[PDB]
Motif scaffolding. Structure first.
Motif, PDB file in Angstrom:
ATOM      1  N   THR A 490     -10.614 -21.566  11.348  1.00 59.54           N
ATOM      2  CA  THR A 490      -9.216 -21.721  10.926  1.00 59.54           C
ATOM      3  C   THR A 490      -8.402 -20.452  11.186  1.00 59.54           C
ATOM      4  N   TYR A 491      -8.892 -19.310  10.694  1.00 56.42           N
ATOM      5  CA  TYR A 491      -8.201 -18.044  10.905  1.00 56.42           C
ATOM      6  C   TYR A 491      -8.214 -17.633  12.365  1.00 56.42           C
ATOM      7  N   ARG A 492      -9.261 -18.007  13.103  1.00 59.26           N
ATOM      8  CA  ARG A 492      -9.287 -17.734  14.534  1.00 59.26           C
ATOM      9  C   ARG A 492      -8.191 -18.503  15.260  1.00 59.26           C
ATOM     10  N   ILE A 493      -7.950 -19.757  14.857  1.00 59.49           N
ATOM     11  CA  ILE A 493      -6.890 -20.563  15.466  1.00 59.49           C
ATOM     12  C   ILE A 493      -5.510 -19.987  15.155  1.00 59.49           C
ATOM     13  N   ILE A 494      -5.275 -19.579  13.899  1.00 59.27           N
ATOM     14  CA  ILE A 494      -3.977 -18.995  13.526  1.00 59.27           C
ATOM     15  C   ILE A 494      -3.722 -17.693  14.288  1.00 59.27           C
ATOM     16  N   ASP A 520       4.599  -4.701  11.283  1.00 64.77           N
ATOM     17  CA  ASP A 520       4.587  -6.018  10.659  1.00 64.77           C
ATOM     18  C   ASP A 520       4.066  -7.077  11.621  1.00 64.77           C
ATOM     19  N   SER A 521       4.366  -6.907  12.905  1.00 62.43           N
ATOM     20  CA  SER A 521       3.930  -7.839  13.935  1.00 62.43           C
ATOM     21  C   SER A 521       2.545  -7.513  14.478  1.00 62.43           C
ATOM     22  N   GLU A 522       1.814  -6.610  13.830  1.00 64.14           N
ATOM     23  CA  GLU A 522       0.421  -6.352  14.163  1.00 64.14           C
ATOM     24  C   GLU A 522      -0.506  -6.359  12.959  1.00 64.14           C
ATOM     25  N   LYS A 523       0.007  -6.109  11.749  1.00 60.93           N
ATOM     26  CA  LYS A 523      -0.787  -6.313  10.543  1.00 60.93           C
ATOM     27  C   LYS A 523      -1.170  -7.777  10.387  1.00 60.93           C
ATOM     28  N   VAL A 524      -0.245  -8.688  10.709  1.00 59.35           N
ATOM     29  CA  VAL A 524      -0.498 -10.123  10.581  1.00 59.35           C
ATOM     30  C   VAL A 524      -1.421 -10.673  11.654  1.00 59.35           C
ATOM     31  N   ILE A 525      -1.868  -9.851  12.599  1.00 54.89           N
ATOM     32  CA  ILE A 525      -2.916 -10.229  13.532  1.00 54.89           C
ATOM     33  C   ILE A 525      -4.228  -9.521  13.215  1.00 54.89           C
ATOM     34  N   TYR A 529      -7.733 -11.192  11.970  1.00 56.95           N
ATOM     35  CA  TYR A 529      -9.007 -10.991  12.661  1.00 56.95           C
ATOM     36  C   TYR A 529     -10.092 -10.462  11.729  1.00 56.95           C
ATOM     37  N   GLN A 530      -9.728  -9.617  10.760  1.00 58.95           N
ATOM     38  CA  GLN A 530     -10.710  -9.160   9.777  1.00 58.95           C
ATOM     39  C   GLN A 530     -11.173 -10.302   8.870  1.00 58.95           C
ATOM     40  N   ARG A 531     -10.245 -11.170   8.453  1.00 63.68           N
ATOM     41  CA  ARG A 531     -10.612 -12.321   7.633  1.00 63.68           C
ATOM     42  C   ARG A 531     -11.401 -13.354   8.427  1.00 63.68           C
ATOM     43  N   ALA A 532     -11.220 -13.396   9.748  1.00 59.35           N
ATOM     44  CA  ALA A 532     -12.091 -14.219  10.578  1.00 59.35           C
ATOM     45  C   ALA A 532     -13.489 -13.621  10.664  1.00 59.35           C
ATOM     46  N   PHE A 533     -13.575 -12.291  10.793  1.00 62.16           N
ATOM     47  CA  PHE A 533     -14.866 -11.626  10.948  1.00 62.16           C
ATOM     48  C   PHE A 533     -15.715 -11.736   9.688  1.00 62.16           C
ATOM     49  N   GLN A 534     -15.086 -11.670   8.512  1.00 62.91           N
ATOM     50  CA  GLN A 534     -15.836 -11.769   7.258  1.00 62.91           C
ATOM     51  C   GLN A 534     -16.493 -13.139   7.103  1.00 62.91           C
ATOM     52  N   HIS A 535     -15.719 -14.204   7.321  1.00 71.58           N
ATOM     53  CA  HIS A 535     -16.237 -15.558   7.183  1.00 71.58           C
ATOM     54  C   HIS A 535     -17.126 -15.967   8.349  1.00 71.58           C
ATOM     55  N   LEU A 536     -17.077 -15.259   9.478  1.00 73.17           N
ATOM     56  CA  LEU A 536     -18.070 -15.506  10.513  1.00 73.17           C
ATOM     57  C   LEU A 536     -19.337 -14.678  10.341  1.00 73.17           C
ATOM     58  N   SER A 537     -19.281 -13.574   9.595  1.00 68.59           N
ATOM     59  CA  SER A 537     -20.479 -12.795   9.307  1.00 68.59           C
ATOM     60  C   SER A 537     -21.275 -13.357   8.142  1.00 68.59           C
ATOM     61  N   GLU A 538     -20.592 -13.965   7.162  1.00 67.85           N
ATOM     62  CA  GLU A 538     -21.298 -14.607   6.055  1.00 67.85           C
ATOM     63  C   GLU A 538     -22.140 -15.787   6.525  1.00 67.85           C
ATOM     64  N   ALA A 539     -21.754 -16.417   7.633  1.00 71.36           N
ATOM     65  CA  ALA A 539     -22.459 -17.569   8.173  1.00 71.36           C
ATOM     66  C   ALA A 539     -23.774 -17.215   8.843  1.00 71.36           C
ATOM     67  N   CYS A 561     -16.927 -12.079  18.820  1.00 67.52           N
ATOM     68  CA  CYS A 561     -16.940 -10.632  19.025  1.00 67.52           C
ATOM     69  C   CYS A 561     -16.852 -10.263  20.502  1.00 67.52           C
ATOM     70  N   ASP A 562     -17.430 -11.079  21.390  1.00 70.43           N
ATOM     71  CA  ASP A 562     -17.359 -10.778  22.816  1.00 70.43           C
ATOM     72  C   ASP A 562     -15.948 -10.952  23.359  1.00 70.43           C
ATOM     73  N   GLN A 563     -15.246 -12.005  22.928  1.00 72.11           N
ATOM     74  CA  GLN A 563     -13.858 -12.168  23.350  1.00 72.11           C
ATOM     75  C   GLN A 563     -12.958 -11.111  22.728  1.00 72.11           C
TER      76      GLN A 563
END
Length: 1259
Positions: A490-494, A520-525, A529-539, A561-563
């Motif tokens: 989900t966060y990866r798509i956003i 502001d236009s880079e914190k929201v990316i 990406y950090q919130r994507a990494f957390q939920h992909l590392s818990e898996a 991580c490769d992309q």
């Protein structure tokens, strides 16, 4: 037997009608054929039991005679659609549409194609050159994808329209709109809009249906099945509405209304009488239905699949009706719930197959089972009111999970919104509900552009982070892995959506921008990406407590991580990629086996850490998963980071000493190690494996014996060109001439220098015994010549060494080692090459061993003149192989490995696996340098020989022996247009004829060959109209695949002998990859400007359609699958820059001086200049580029400072008046537009009218 009756009658009728044409002159036979045509119309119009070997019997004898071809477009379609014999009616209408537009037959052929899927061909039908409107094509485009809710909208919004100011929408097209809107309402579960639309076209003011359907036999073949289906499927729940039973009762009083029901239905009738609470008449009707299935299924033909599948897809509903009848009749299984539990436990394991059964079958079986359960809940009156709902929920959720996979989002959404009132009772229902919702949203937003693709995946956020953890997510582990791998995506798509159009999409909202900012236009990316990494590392931190269920959790985080690293290129991520990919390569997974050069590049590019991390992970991996990359690892065994490769090379050399033998000699031919502490360990390791291999010299004599049969003139020209490109330019290179003369000293020196090292030829013992009177002067002065000026002395001897030769040795005694091979001892029998194809444990006992060669060696008449040998296996079977003289066959190996990666990426894509698209390859081994073997293919023949043997004897004679033939006419045209007979006429002809001369002469050269050659060749060997439609479609799909795949890695020289057709399947095979990247438009004198070969025969095969229905959608599908992940082929392409071949080095010097591209640095060779340029060109045309921009770029790089150069760029760019490729941007194109201008460039008389004469563009 019915089928041999059909074949005997259809043979006898044609025999009599073909023998009667002697007498009975032309005024009587016309009336005979008119009476036969009226009789056949009468049969097709009065039949009511559509028996298949009678319906398809008259259409086989009518479609062969020219007088019965104009038969009946409205009865043929309605008969073939109901008796499932559609490939005969398709051939009948397509033979009628040959020989004002014919909109009736063009609509009935479309109705026949629409019923069996086949939405590819429905793009060359519905155009504006046959007078059809533009509301048909836009509505078929919403059904080619499973989106039957916009097409059923804009069919309704096209029926009731009265303006039509272009003409008039004729009644055939209105029948087509009514029928297609009926099917689009059928494919959903709207059982009111299929009832009203079917009972609102015959009478007014509440129609009675009682006799109105039974008159005028067009309102009966179309409006009756949807009436009875909608009324019954609404009867199976809900309220009474007694209006179908009375219609059945008042219909059954007749005879033809009684044998039309209960012969074609029987199952709706059995359900209708089971609804009335009597089981006795339903028994008779379901037994009648079973007998009808058997008599129909044993009657449809043998080689007509998918009719058998669509007939076999009803047996589960039939036998579930029969099982309910047998269950409810007895008494021992209606008192205790012990036979009820076995029913509820055998129902939840007998689903139909997901992704392969349409949703009407699933709707049938699910509504039947819930009707049965609702009856059994009352008949089994002696907690039981919960075990049926726990069956119904898990029966509907699987139907949702199969509706999602077939892109039925509008059908799955109402099933979700109906499975929501009672999902919040228990706890383990909600997690399956929200995960089906989230997977539906992730599958749904793959096609929307932006700013709504953001919005749907923003809507599936607030429910994924609900309470949900009341001792469920902590206790269970699958419900904890799946929510994490979903919330990562989900966060990866956003965050991937707000990174192409950054500013405006975060502005077109009122609260959703604040909701995104609160995640502001880079914190929201970066914070996303950090919130994507957390939920992909818990898996994977919470999935190491347990294959195929952890491979996805590994490879998701690995690919993310490769992309991210490949985006950073333009934390511990290079460490985290390697172990998480190798742990999933240790478990069996083919999706991680092809991602090996990404590891071998991330180690080279990040060597400050993670190089010790590859050692401990490559130590414990089964070493048969690197036999693909042995030629990729033996080139890394010269330079740095040879550790973590050395262990696997040592293991494979230990326990598989026949795979890694042949790639080791080519790397051992040139190493040139360093002079450090590691540089000595490298020499001792390579020396250890060199001592270990060949097992006493059984391989080296094989390589030498296959060297000692080729023509010596090829290696003579190799030596001559190597001394001419090293002495006659500047004598500054020390020791190089005296080093390269050692091969000339060894082979073709004194006549005992091959005789002492190898076996004496029967031909070199005649060659060296004559070439010593000319070698005495070589032994005198050419040992230390150093004159560097005269080459005519070599020229005269190389011209004189082509007269007293005989390149046929006429037997195998020319190399007397294989004629006296004669194995007698266990001398490590040497296992005929080209095996160990990739994956699995190889099992080396089943592999064929070499046990001899044949006495018949033959020679192929090409330029380099390869030979063909017949090597016999130990089990007495021949194997044909092709040995090549002195060329480096490593580019062929690299592009066949690239084809292996290509049809590995084809089988993962879902849209191409349904079409079964695979490139057909073959084996090539570069044994040493200047020696290789190629697997010769059996049962094939060349495309040119197929087209040259399909013709008649008066055709080929007047094609090869004619002054007005397109061979000689093109030569006379080139003489007239320029003035000279030789080459250079191609240079002056671009500055000669204008645009509107080349086309008008090209059509005259093109319309002198016959137009029906592939169709004649495919009708000579098909034997059935159900098989012609198979062979021609397979040929067209395979040729579309190789045409789109010979362009990404840009292959030229696609002439008429590089295509092999298989004479047992009808499929094209492409060979001979000499020009592999752009090198026919860069280094040839007269260039090539087309991307592939789509000439006149390939488009004349598909008449009455053209090459815009089938050869278009296959190319769209294959090129979209290639541009899905663009990284794989460019990552495989780096073996060219690691160990470059001689073919990328004999012309690198030519580009160094006589060439172009001075924008890049040229001081570095083969690390940044040549192969990085070829990789960046392929990456540009894989990221979307104009096919006329790449051609003029490669034409600028190699053909600048030409006399006719702006003429080249003017021809291969477009014209803005005929060509679509001139009206497009230069870059950033889309997929369909890219393949549109791609196919525009291939068929162009401004290009094909001016090409090389040996390409043969007219045929």
């Amino acid at each position: 037997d019915p089928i041999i009756a059909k074949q005997l009658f259809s043979s006898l009728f044609s025999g009599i009608l073909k023998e009667m044409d002697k007498f009975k002159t032309l005024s009587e036979k016309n009336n005979i054929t008119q009476k036969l045509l009226q009789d056949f119309n009468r049969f097709l119009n009065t039949t009511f039991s559509f028996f298949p070997p009678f319906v398809s019997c008259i259409q086989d004898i009518s479609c062969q005679h020219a007088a019965l071809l104009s038969l009946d477009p409205a009865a043929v379609s309605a008969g073939c659609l109901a008796s499932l014999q559609q490939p005969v009616g398709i051939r009948l209408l397509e033979e009628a549409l040959l020989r004002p537009p014919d909109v009736l037959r063009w609509v009935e052929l479309a109705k026949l194609y629409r019923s069996i899927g086949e939405y590819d061909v429905l793009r060359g039908i519905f155009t504006s050159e046959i007078g059809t409107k533009q509301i048909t094509q836009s509505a078929l485009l919403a059904e080619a994808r499973s989106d039957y809710s916009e097409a059923a909208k804009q069919y309704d919004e096209a029926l009731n329209k009265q303006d039509w100011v272009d003409g008039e929408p004729t009644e055939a097209e209105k029948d087509f709109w009514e029928l297609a809107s009926l099917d689009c309402y059928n494919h959903l579960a709207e059982w009111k809009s299929l009832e009203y639309c079917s009972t609102a076209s015959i009478d007014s003011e509440n129609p009675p249906d009682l006799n109105k359907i039974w008159s005028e036999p067009f309102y009966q073949e179309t409006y009756l099945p949807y009436m009875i289906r909608s009324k019954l499927k609404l009867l199976l729940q809900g309220e009474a509405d007694q209006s179908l039973l009375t219609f059945i009762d008042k219909a059954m009083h007749g005879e033809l209304q009684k044998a039309i029901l209960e012969l074609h239905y029987s199952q709706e009738l059995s359900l209708l009488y089971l609804l009335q609470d009597d089981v006795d008449r339903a028994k008779y009707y379901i037994q009648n239905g079973i007998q009808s299935f058997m008599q129909n299924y044993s009657s449809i033909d043998v080689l007509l699949h998918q009719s058998r599948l669509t007939k076999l897809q009803s047996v589960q509903a039939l036998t579930e009706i029969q099982e309910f009848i047998s269950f409810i009749s007895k008494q021992g299984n209606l008192s205790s719930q012990v036979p009820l539990k076995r029913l509820l436990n055998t129902w939840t394991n007998r689903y139909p197959d997901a992704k392969m059964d349409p949703m009407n079958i699933w709707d049938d079986i699910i509504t039947n089972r819930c009707f049965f359960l609702s009856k059994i809940e009352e008949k089994l009156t002696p907690d039981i009111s919960s075990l049926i709902r726990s069956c119904k929920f898990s029966m509907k959720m699987k139907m949702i999970d199969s509706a999602r996979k077939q892109n039925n989002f509008s059908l799955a959404m109402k099933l979700l919104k109906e499975l929501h009132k009672e999902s919040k009772t228990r706890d383990d229902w909600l997690v399956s509900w929200v995960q089906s919702y989230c997977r539906l949203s992730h599958c749904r937003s793959r096609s929307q552009g932006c700013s709504e693709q953001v919005l749907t995946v923003l809507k599936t956020v607030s429910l994924l982070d609900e309470n949900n953890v009341s001792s469920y997510l902590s206790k269970n582990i699958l419900a904890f892995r799946d929510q994490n791998i979903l919330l990562g995506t989900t966060y990866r798509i956003i965050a991937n959506a707000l990174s192409s159009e950054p500013a405006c999409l975060a502005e077109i909202e009122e609260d959703k921008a604040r909701r995104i900012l609160e995640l502001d236009s880079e914190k929201v990316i970066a914070g996303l990406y950090q919130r994507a990494f957390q939920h992909l590392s818990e898996a994977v931190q919470a999935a190491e407590e347990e294959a195929a269920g952890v491979i996805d959790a590994y490879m998701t985080l690995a690919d993310f991580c490769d992309q991210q690293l490949r985006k950073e290129e333009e934390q511990a991520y290079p460490a985290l990629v390697v172990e998480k990919m190798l742990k999933a390569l240790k478990l069996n997974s083919n999706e991680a086996r092809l991602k090996f050069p990404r590891l071998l590049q991330i180690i080279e590019r990040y060597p400050e850490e993670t190089l010790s991390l590859m050692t401990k992970e490559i130590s414990s991996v089964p070493c048969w998963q690197f036999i693909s990359w042995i030629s990729h690892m033996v080139a890394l065994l010269d330079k740095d980071q040879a550790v973590a490769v050395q262990h696997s090379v040592e293991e494979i050399t230990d326990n598989y000493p026949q795979a890694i033998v042949y790639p080791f000699i080519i790397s051992s031919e040139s190493y040139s190690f360093k002079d450090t502490s590691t540089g000595h360990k490298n020499k001792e390791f390579v020396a250890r494996i060199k001592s270990k291999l060949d097992q006493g010299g059984v391989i080296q004599d094989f390589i030498n014996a296959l060297d000692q049969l080729s023509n010596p003139e090829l290696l003579f020209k190799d030596w001559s060109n190597d001394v001419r490109a090293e002495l006659a330019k500047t004598p500054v290179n020390k020791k190089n001439i005296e080093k390269m003369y050692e091969r000339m000293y060894a082979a073709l020196g004194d006549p005992k220098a091959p005789g002492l090292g190898a076996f004496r030829r029967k031909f070199i013992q005649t060659f060296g015994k004559e070439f010593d009177k000319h070698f005495g002067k070589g032994g005198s002065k050419l040992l230390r010549m150093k004159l560097s000026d005269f080459n005519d002395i070599t020229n005269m001897l190389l011209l004189k060494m082509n007269k007293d030769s005989k390149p046929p040795g006429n037997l195998k005694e020319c190399s007397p080692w294989m004629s006296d091979f004669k194995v007698e001892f266990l001398r490590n029998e040497l296992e005929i090459p080209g095996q160990y194809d990739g994956r699995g444990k190889p099992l080396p006992e089943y592999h064929v061993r070499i046990a001899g060669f044949d006495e018949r060696v033959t020679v192929m008449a090409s330029l380099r003149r390869p030979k063909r040998i017949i090597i016999r296996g130990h089990d007495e079977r021949e194997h044909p192989f092709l040995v090549k003289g002195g060329e480096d066959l490593r580019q062929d190996q690299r592009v066949e490995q690239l084809f292996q990666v290509m049809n590995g990426i084809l089988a993962q894509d879902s849209a191409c696996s349904q079409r079964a698209l695979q490139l057909r390859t073959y084996s090539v081994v570069p044994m040493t340098s200047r020696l290789g073997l190629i697997e010769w293919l059996e049962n094939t023949v060349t495309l040119k020989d197929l087209l040259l043997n399909t013709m008649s004897q008066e055709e080929k004679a007047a094609y090869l022996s004619d002054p007005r033939a397109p061979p000689c006419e093109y030569k006379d045209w080139l003489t007239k247009m320029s003035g000279k007979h030789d080459v250079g006429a191609y240079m002056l002809m671009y500055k000669g004829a204008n645009r509107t001369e080349t086309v008008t002469s090209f059509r005259k050269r093109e319309s002198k060959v016959p137009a029906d050659l592939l169709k004649r060749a495919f009708v000579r060997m098909s034997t059935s109209p159900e098989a012609f439609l198979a062979l021609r479609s397979h040929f067209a799909s395979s040729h579309a695949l190789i045409c789109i795949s010979h362009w990404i890695l840009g292959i030229g020289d696609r002439h008429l002998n590089n295509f092999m057709v298989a004479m047992e399947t009808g499929g094209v095979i492409g060979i001979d990859f000499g020009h592999a990247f752009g090198s026919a438009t860069q280094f040839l004198p007269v260039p090539e400007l087309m991307p592939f070969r789509l000439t006149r025969q390939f488009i004349n095969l598909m008449l009455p359609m053209k090459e815009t229905g089938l050869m278009y959608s296959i190319m769209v599908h294959a090129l979209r699958a290639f541009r899905s992940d663009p990284g794989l082929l460019t990552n495989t392409m780096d073996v060219f820059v690691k160990e470059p071949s001689f073919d990328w080095k004999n012309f690198e010097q030519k580009m160094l001086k006589k060439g172009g591209s001075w924008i890049q640095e040229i001081n570095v060779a083969e690390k940044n200049w040549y192969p990085r340029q070829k990789i960046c060109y392929a990456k540009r045309k894989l990221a979307g580029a104009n096919p006329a921009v790449i051609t003029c770029d490669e034409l600028l790089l190699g053909h600048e400072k030409a006399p006719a150069f702006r003429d080249y760029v003017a021809v291969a760019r477009g014209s803005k008046d005929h060509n679509i490729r001139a009206q497009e941007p230069e870059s950033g194109l889309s997929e369909e537009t890219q393949v549109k201008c791609l196919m525009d460039q291939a068929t162009d008389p401004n290009i094909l009218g001016r090409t090389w004469e040996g390409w043969e563009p007219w045929m």
